[PDB]
Amino acid sequence: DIVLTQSPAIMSASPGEKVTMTCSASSSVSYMHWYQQKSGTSPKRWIYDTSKLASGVPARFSGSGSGTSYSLTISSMEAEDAATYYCQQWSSNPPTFGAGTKLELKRTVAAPSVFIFPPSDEQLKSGTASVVCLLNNFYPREAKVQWKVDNALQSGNSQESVTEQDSKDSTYSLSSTLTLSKADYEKHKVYACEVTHQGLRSPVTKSFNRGECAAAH
Amino acid sequence: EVQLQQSGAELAKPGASVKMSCKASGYTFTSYWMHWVKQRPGQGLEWIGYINPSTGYTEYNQKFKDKATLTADKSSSTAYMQLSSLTSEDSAVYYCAPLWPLGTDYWGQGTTLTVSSASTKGPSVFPLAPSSKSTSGGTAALGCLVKDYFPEPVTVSWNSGALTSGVHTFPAVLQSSGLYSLSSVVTVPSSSLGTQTYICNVNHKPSNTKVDKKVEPKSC
Ligand SMILES: OC[C@H]1O[C@@H](O)[C@H](O)[C@@H](O)[C@@H]1O
């Protein structure tokens, strides 16, 4: 099968900026197609036969390329162009798709507001402990969130969830949830969330000691 | 005008079978090959195969030859896809699309399939309590953790919908347990913490559970 690699996987563009995304093929192809998928909707044909715009696609869009190298270009980025773009070939069987380029709106850097939530008494009664660290309204998305339990860096027991780019201020919000058994939770004292992000001059730490926070015990 | 209507979401257990439909209107059903594509989050798009509704001829991605079965009915303008011997790797959104020949740019709305041996279960709602550990200067954050429910989705509101500003409800994550979990958070002025009451309205109704949990300023 012909493998299509789209670069970059995720990119951000300022308003009015010129944007170009590439679709590379592991073997030569004669034509390239492009589909646009907005979040929570179906893909739609956007460009066909390398350079032909689908009906209703605005004139700022264009595509080009030949052989093993193709590209899609927006002359002037507009907010409605935020979406994921998939390239697709059928010079060889079976037809294959790229993994997509997610194009998002670039805005100024905004440092996250960090909050830490100790586990509720109700959940401790049920025998598990969830510690939640919240990164609110930040940009860009890249953020390093480290859990330390008595200075021990945690691995494999946390999971992150991130919102879509906010429609109004173009920021992201992120939650990191540290899940422990009640037994392991009561075996340690200090629970810390350390956040490293371009908008912070130095990393921010939110932490608590199991015990300076009133509870059932 | 042109319409590709796909059947509703499907929940199945491992090893079971499922058959989904794709009703075409607004164009000559026989004049376009109906392709089927699979989409998982964190994955790209995968081409399964196509059917020529005029002749019934089908071509398959070798990767899906023993998984998918493509049918078409001309009289109802409907194409069908059956997926057998289901595994968790088959949980995805599946689109039908008349990709060839060119002329119709639209795809179907998609059919979401979740295959899981998990049982229907309502969530436990735990407070994400505000306090000094949840306060910057004049802004405080609070929320509700909606944990251990199945299947998707859950709906969360605040103060019966009266509070929408600053609300972030995160996408659900499927835990290794096979149950879903998410948190919904809100930022409020810290001065209003001890005076105004904040309740989250958490709803997951495949289990028909509706819970409103008061999130209260806890003291650290
Ligand atoms: O499908 C690609 C294009 O083919 C043309 O024949 C149609 O007029 C367009 O509506 C369509 O976008």
Residue numbers in the entry:
A (entry chain B): 1 to 217
B (entry chain A): 1 to 220
What did the authors write?
Here, we have determined the crystal structure of the antigen binding fragment (Fab) of anti-SCH antibody JoJ48C11, both in the apo form and in complex with the oligosaccharide laminarihexaose. The JoJ48C11 Fab fragment adopts the expected heterodimeric structure of a heavy chain fragment and a light chain both consisting of a constant (C) and a variable (V) immunoglobulin (Ig) domain. The Ig domains show the typical immunoglobulin fold characterized by two anti-parallel β-sheets packed against each other. The model is consistent with experimental data and validates our previous hypothesis about the specificity of JoJ48C11 towards SCH and other similar β-(1,6)-branched β-(1,3)-D-glucans, namely that the β-(1,6)-bound D-glucose residues in conjunction with the triple-helical structure constitute the binding epitope for the antibody JoJ48C11.
